[PDB]
Design a protein around this ligand. Sequence first.
Ligand SMILES: C[n+]1ccc(C[C@@H](SCCNC(=O)CCNC(=O)[C@H](O)C(C)(C)COP(=O)(O)OP(=O)(O)OC[C@H]2O[C@@H](n3cnc4c(N)ncnc43)[C@H](O)[C@@H]2OP(=O)(O)O)c2cccc3ccccc23)cc1
Ligand code: NA
Ligand code: NA
Length: 575
Amino acid sequence: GLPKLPVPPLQQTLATYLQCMRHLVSEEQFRKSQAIVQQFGAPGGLGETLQQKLLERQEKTANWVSEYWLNDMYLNNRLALPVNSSPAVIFARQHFPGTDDQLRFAASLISGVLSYKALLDSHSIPTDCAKGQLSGQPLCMKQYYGLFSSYRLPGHTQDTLVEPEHVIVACCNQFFVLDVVINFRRLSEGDLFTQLRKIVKMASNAAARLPPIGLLTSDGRSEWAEARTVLVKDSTNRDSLDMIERCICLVCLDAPGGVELSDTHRALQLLHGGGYSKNGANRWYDKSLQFVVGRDGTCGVVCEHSPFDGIVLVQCTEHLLKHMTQLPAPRRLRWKCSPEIQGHLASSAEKLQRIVKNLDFIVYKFDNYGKTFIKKQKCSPDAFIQVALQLAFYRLHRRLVPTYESASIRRFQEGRVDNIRSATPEALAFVRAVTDHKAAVPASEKLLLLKDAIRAQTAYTVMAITGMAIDNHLLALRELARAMCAALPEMFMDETYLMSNRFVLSTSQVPTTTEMFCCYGPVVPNGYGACYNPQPETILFCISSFHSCAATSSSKFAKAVEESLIDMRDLCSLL
Ligand SMILES: C[n+]1ccc(C[C@@H](SCCNC(=O)CCNC(=O)[C@H](O)C(C)(C)COP(=O)(O)OP(=O)(O)OC[C@H]2O[C@@H](n3cnc4c(N)ncnc43)[C@H](O)[C@@H]2OP(=O)(O)O)c2cccc3ccccc23)cc1
Ligand code: NA
Ligand code: NA
């Protein structure tokens, strides 16, 4: 009973687009972009033709952007999924004195998964109602049904999102089939614990060890598509891939790390496993959910997020963790490795280690204040924090950049997200006043600039979540144009448009109720990834960047965030 994603008016989107980019390009580049957009948007022109094709599309589809967005955000992306794509959720520290304590946790977690899947298959789950901005409104539930049912196949140029029930268990880079529902008749926690004891014993036998095929899923998508094409030439490889493809989830029983179990190092283990020499091959990145249960108590889940976004994921995992309860041998999946496959594995190992060494990651806990203080200033906490991130970026790098912030459009049928473009002209005015000390702008006027930047950020936020923002609209017009002619219209070849979609700062808010946190890598080589968790009295930031970029630094950016939050508290405390 949810409404269809709206199609905003064309002239609205084009005027918002120009206002979004004017302050981020030169005078001359903008003048050219203005002329291009005017011709695109002229009466009887190409824009209007495309808009009419888009309204026809809205009438005939449940959601007119779903296919375009899924390809542009995920399936067309050629980069390896670790760090570049798959986010990580880190649970609370656990203490596993013995192996059976780790395996009791795993058994308890798996049966929590089985019972959660039974609720979904009940189709009796009450509709989620929004929290925060525009509270109380009903939200789409489709994403819950992609948590367990999905596998992402690699393609040469574009990926594809695709019996008795079983889990796959990864241990010592070996994969084991663990059947769990054996005719609508679930195995108990006790049975699962017993089955996991057998897997650990068998995975420990070095005479029986098979090559670490999971490492192949860590490569570039076109490279893994090619390697997979080799594998499927043999029958027993095909059967093994089939079991992984139809599994409920992965459960990875990781070896202990060597390092201090800081929040930052626990996150690193969930994001890439520390590479081939630690837990990096104890993975299968094509599958949507990989639950990690490390021997040292490091536990979380790695997500192939093409079928769902973070809010739905965390509601599931918080459900699982809260409800957790305090016979043939599982089959080991077999493989036949060509001489060629041996070479694919060597390159996968080398490419994966470059990712491991390239990632610069920090978990930073701002503890001077949280949402409560911000609400007392009559501000949205998310908008407050977004403005602070723009100040952080500007005081460090002395420029503002196209920024991405996730906004859920789950108020509409099959809605996923649109983009809140936080790098507004009001943000620019504020951060310049704060950092340009020659200008000597009085603190009272800085406060007025702070309040107007928050106002603009909230206004864009409301627009985005009601389906009236620009990114999805423009994407659809672009891909509708592409279908009529491979030569795209000038508006989408314009350097201004290409720049507008290089998100040097890529952000999202994922609040949790518990001690878990979320993190992901940047989406451009010279950029940051920034996932935050605002609580009443604290704000948790997970900051990523790439060591190969000499300008970026996760530690420096985190100190800039702290400085920006203190500056903004001092400004709000004036009046
Ligand atoms: C490029 N790429 C794409 C994707 C990814 C992976 C991501 S996938 C995206 C996951 N993220 C989302 O999907 C975010 C969805 N969120 C929304 O869309 C929100 O709507 C948003 C953020 C727009 C606004 O945030 P808000 O909280 O709604 O608004 P607020 O902050 O203003 O309200 C708070 C409190 O303040 C009150 N209030 C408001 N105004 C006030 C005022 N003026 N005065 C006083 N009070 C005021 C409110 O009433 C409330 O009150 P309270 O409830 O506390 O009592 C991901 C991350 C992590 C893990 C993943 C795992 C799996 C899959 C994906 C994962 C990475 C990179
Ligand atoms: Na978008
Ligand atoms: Na860097």
